[PDB]
Amino acid sequence: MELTPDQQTLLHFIMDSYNKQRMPQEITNKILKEAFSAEENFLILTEMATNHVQVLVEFTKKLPGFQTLDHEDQIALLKGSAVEAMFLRSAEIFNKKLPSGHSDLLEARIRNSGISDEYITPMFSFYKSIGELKMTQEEYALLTAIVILSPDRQYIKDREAVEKLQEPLLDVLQKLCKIHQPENPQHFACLLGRLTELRTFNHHHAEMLMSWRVNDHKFTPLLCEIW
Amino acid sequence: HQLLRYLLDK
Numbered sequence: 001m002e003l004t005p006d007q008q009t010l011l012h013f014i015m016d017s018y019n020k021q022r023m024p025q026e027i028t029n030k031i032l033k034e035a036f037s038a039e040e041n042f043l044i045l046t047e048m049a050t051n052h053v054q055v056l057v058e059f060t061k062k063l064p065g066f067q068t069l070d071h072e073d074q075i076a077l078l079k080g081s082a083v084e085a086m087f088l089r090s091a092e093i094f095n096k097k098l099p100s101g102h103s104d105l106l107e108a109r110i111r112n113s114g115i116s117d118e119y120i121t122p123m124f125s126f127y128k129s130i131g132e133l134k135m136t137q138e139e140y141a142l143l144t145a146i147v148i149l150s151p152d153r154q155y156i157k158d159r160e161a162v163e164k165l166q167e168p169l170l171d172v173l174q175k176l177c178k179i180h181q182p183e184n185p186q187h188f189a190c191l192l193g194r195l196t197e198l199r200t201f202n203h204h205h206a207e208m209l210m211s212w213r214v215n216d217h218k219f220t221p222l223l224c225e226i227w
Numbered sequence: 228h229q230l231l232r233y234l235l236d237k
């Protein structure tokens with residue numbers, strides 16, 4: 001069995017925009033050079049958060065049919081998925097894109113940025129669970145697209161339009177699971193398990209931001225005003 | 228919404 005020419009086309013358009021994504025060198029150099037203070041470590045994570053927002057929007061814009069949606073629903077989808085997409089991209093950066101030494105330094109910085117263990121521990125737990133799945137680039141790109149095109153996010157006026165965009169991505173991901181892992185019929189179910197685990201980070205994240213409202217060091221108006 | 232609107236409409 002194989003993907004139909006239309007499914008190959010759809011996957012190609014998703015792979016192309018996903019492969020364009022790159023963590024800039026200036027952020028990488030900072031992980032290596034900057035002071036190990038809570039303020040400097042937090043400033044590095046602020047740079048990573050702002051980079052993710054820019055990368056997420058450029059990726060989403062190139063998703064087949066995204067620009068055909070009503071403008072307000074495009075905003076609602078980006079707002080509702082930004083946090084879940086951050087954890088997915090972060091998992092990939094930590095487990096595949098960053099060299100062993102650089103990731104160990106990034107983890108050191110995260111664990112010393114002034115953020116409570118309550119908001120650090122589930123994050124590293126998720127990275128380990130994702131890494132266990134030995135996910136391909138195709139699976140990372142499709143999951144990211146499925147998370148963004150979730151028709152159940154708040155403040156979407158035309159959910160059916162979004163359903164029509166997400167359903168063919170789920171068919172493609174299941175077909176890729178049946179093609180590349182035929183001896184493991186539960187591989188698709190393992191990928192859906194990551195979707196449900198990602199949703200729990202929204203309440204953890206919102207709780208984390210709400211607690212910074214009486215803090216002068218951690219309060220970042222650019223990201224806080226939206227999320 | 229201003230930042231997202233700008234990045235989306237660029």
Ligand SMILES: CC(=O)Nc1cccc(N(C(=O)c2ccc(Cl)cc2)[C@H](C(=O)NC2CCCCC2)C2CCCCC2)c1
Pocket residue numbers: 042045046047048049050052053082083086090094110115119120123201204205208220223227
């Ligand atoms: C539970 C949780 O979110 N933990 C937890 C721990 C450490 C850093 C973070 N953050 C990261 O960006 C981040 C950075 C690097 C990695 Cl490898 C993982 C995550 C914060 C964040 O949530 N950014 C969101 C991005 C998408 C739009 C809504 C804001 C960020 C907020 C602004 C000030 C600095 C920190 C988050």
